[PDB]
Design an enzyme around this catalytic site. Structure first.
Site, PDB file in Angstrom:
ATOM      1  N   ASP A  49      -0.106 -35.528 -57.693  1.00 35.58           N
ATOM      2  CA  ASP A  49      -0.568 -34.564 -56.675  1.00 35.58           C
ATOM      3  C   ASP A  49      -2.004 -34.068 -56.771  1.00 35.58           C
ATOM      4  O   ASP A  49      -2.826 -34.496 -58.012  1.00 35.58           O
ATOM      5  CB  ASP A  49       0.673 -33.502 -56.319  1.00 35.58           C
ATOM      6  CG  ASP A  49       0.466 -32.564 -57.495  1.00 35.58           C
ATOM      7  OD1 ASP A  49      -0.120 -32.542 -58.624  1.00 35.58           O
ATOM      8  OD2 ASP A  49       1.639 -31.545 -57.520  1.00 35.58           O
ATOM      9  N   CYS A  52      -2.945 -32.898 -60.567  1.00 37.21           N
ATOM     10  CA  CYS A  52      -2.545 -33.598 -61.942  1.00 37.21           C
ATOM     11  C   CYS A  52      -3.344 -33.345 -63.315  1.00 37.21           C
ATOM     12  O   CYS A  52      -2.759 -33.536 -64.120  1.00 37.21           O
ATOM     13  CB  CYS A  52      -2.581 -35.173 -61.631  1.00 37.21           C
ATOM     14  SG  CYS A  52      -3.840 -35.801 -61.451  1.00 37.21           S
ATOM     15  N   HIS A 253      -6.536 -39.476 -61.783  1.00 40.03           N
ATOM     16  CA  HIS A 253      -5.175 -38.832 -62.103  1.00 40.03           C
ATOM     17  C   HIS A 253      -5.257 -38.989 -63.793  1.00 40.03           C
ATOM     18  O   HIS A 253      -5.737 -39.941 -64.405  1.00 40.03           O
ATOM     19  CB  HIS A 253      -4.093 -39.921 -61.491  1.00 40.03           C
ATOM     20  CG  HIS A 253      -4.283 -39.629 -60.013  1.00 40.03           C
ATOM     21  ND1 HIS A 253      -4.031 -38.573 -59.513  1.00 40.03           N
ATOM     22  CD2 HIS A 253      -4.761 -40.535 -59.085  1.00 40.03           C
ATOM     23  CE1 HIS A 253      -4.046 -38.421 -58.014  1.00 40.03           C
ATOM     24  NE2 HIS A 253      -5.043 -39.792 -57.899  1.00 40.03           N
TER      25      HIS A 253
END
EC number: 3.4.19.12
Length: 259
Positions: A49, A52, A253
């Site tokens: 999300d 992260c 991420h």
């Protein structure tokens, strides 16, 4: 499982699931995971999300905590919300009175960190940290606290720069961005979007490391064939800051490698 940091799995099994085929891209990622696997056997996949980078960093930092760091021991930490918000009224543009909300988040971060640090075994700490990261309101409160500490550090760095004091060069880069020329543009255009519409930019990972006083060593798989294959944030930290290691396939991420 309700965890937002997935149970660990073998890193080579993870790579073989994720990266198939013979493309140049896939080969690059495979070399990158092979590099990580020399030091870490397993990987925990962090919920992807917009929080992260914070999730991955905090989870790793708190799961490994054997002490409460001096910055969280300092009583002034609890006084910061009132001092800042009173001084800088534009902080009330914060996208979640506000002072009590922030103070509750900081109190929670301090208490949970202290509780982990005092646990008698590393397993007790793993259990308690798994329970903390289960997508409940306590987890997102921790991110509000770390965003606020990022903002405080940004304000200090900006104010040092104006007083003509020496500042780390990443802060010159931070405030050079056309959408982030000062702390209020940082808040409205960047921090308010974190966890909402986007994750931390590269130059904000330096601010995160400064905010929590941890050295963040990231394997940057998209940079594998370059000297940024690993980048450390900040580049020259106090030797006393704990190290957390992360992997990022593309600077968006972050996942957590596990020894």
């Amino acid at each position: 499982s309700r965890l937002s940091v997935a149970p660990e799995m073998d890193i080579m099994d993870y790579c073989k699931k994720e990266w198939r085929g013979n493309t140049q891209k896939a080969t690059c990622m495979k070399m990158g995971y092979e590099e990580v696997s020399q030091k870490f056997t397993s990987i925990r996949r962090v919920r992807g999300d917009n929080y992260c980078a914070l999730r991955a960093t905090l989870f790793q930092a708190m799961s490994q905590a054997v002490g409460l760091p001096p910055w969280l021991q300092d009583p002034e930490l609890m006084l910061l919300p009132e001092k800042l918000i009173s001084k800088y009224n534009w902080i009330k543009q914060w996208k979640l009175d506000l002072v009590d909300k922030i103070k509750e988040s900081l109190t929670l971060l301090r208490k949970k960190w202290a509780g982990l640090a005092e646990m008698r075994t590393a397993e007790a700490r793993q259990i308690a940290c798994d329970e903390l990261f289960t997508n409940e309101a306590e987890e997102y409160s921790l991110y509000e606290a770390v965003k606020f500490l990022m903002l405080n550090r940004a304000i200090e760095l900006y104010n040092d720069k104006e007083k003509g004091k020496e500042v780390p060069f990443f802060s010159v880069l931070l405030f050079a961005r056309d959408t982030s020329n000062d702390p209020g543009q940082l808040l409205r255009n960047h921090l308010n979007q974190v966890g909402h519409t986007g994750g931390l930019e590269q130059v904000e990972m330096f601010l995160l490391a400064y905010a929590v006083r941890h050295t963040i060593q990231v394997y940057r798989l998209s940079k594998y064939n370059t000297e940024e294959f690993i980048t450390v944030y900040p580049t020259d930290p106090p030797k006393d800051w704990p190290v957390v290691t992360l992997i990022a396939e593309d600077d968006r991420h972050y996942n957590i490698p596990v020894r």
